From a paper:
The three structures are similar and reveal a homodimer with interlocked hydrophobic surfaces buried at the interface and a divalent cation chelated by four histidine residues (two from each monomer). Importantly, the dimer interface involves residues that lie in the core of the hVEGFR1d2 surface that interacts with VEGF-A, VEGF-B or PlGF.
The structures of the P1, C2221 and I222 crystal forms were determined with four molecules, one molecule and three molecules in the asymmetric unit respectively. Three additional Co2+ ions, which exhibited higher B factors, were present in the asymmetric unit and were also coordinated by a histidine residue (His214).
Author numbering:
A (entry chain C), B (entry chain A): 133 to 225
Write the structure that this text describes.
């Protein structure tokens, strides 16, 4: 179990507001775990300065959410040869 | 194409309120299609024409939603020997 909260089967719903900070709360149980953030079904989002921040204690922080962040966001981690996914469905508050 | 709108990969978000009407809008392309309503992963919900009403042009109308209807609801239909599914995720504001 690399993720503290794991929504593999049914995604967790999270509210966002355009123009405001959005946390994708896939924090991990250990600092060695490598996490990838995806937006279904095409995009891989990488940590980048202040736009997208990774904090292993919190998850990914998107500094100012836009309508582009509306949809299915997935955190992925590979450990002990297995792939673990945790899924979030965002929509406006 | 038994369901007019088909949500498989990503379920469609439905806002619900306990004690109020809840519509699961899995309308179908013919009134001769039989549809079953399920709650993941265990339950089947049986329409009785009063508390839960089926209307092929609308979907399932649940009169008095309870917390038991919070979660992943699935409409299933078997036509021409094949099973089709469409998925809804109900959500409390
Ligand atoms: Co295994
Ligand atoms: Co066939
Ligand atoms: Co909402």
């Amino acid at each position: 179990r690399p993720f503290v909260e794991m929504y593999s089967e049914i995604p967790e719903i999270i509210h966002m507001t355009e123009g405001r900070e959005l946390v994708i709360p896939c924090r991990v149980t250990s600092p060695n775990i490598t996490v990838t953030l995806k937006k279904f079904p095409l995009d891989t989002l990488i940590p980048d300065g202040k736009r997208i921040i990774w904090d292993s204690r919190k998850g990914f922080i998107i500094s100012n959410a836009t309508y582009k962040e509306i949809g299915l966001l997935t955190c992925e981690a590979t450990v002990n040869g297995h792939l673990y996914k945790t899924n979030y469905l965002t929509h406006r508050q």
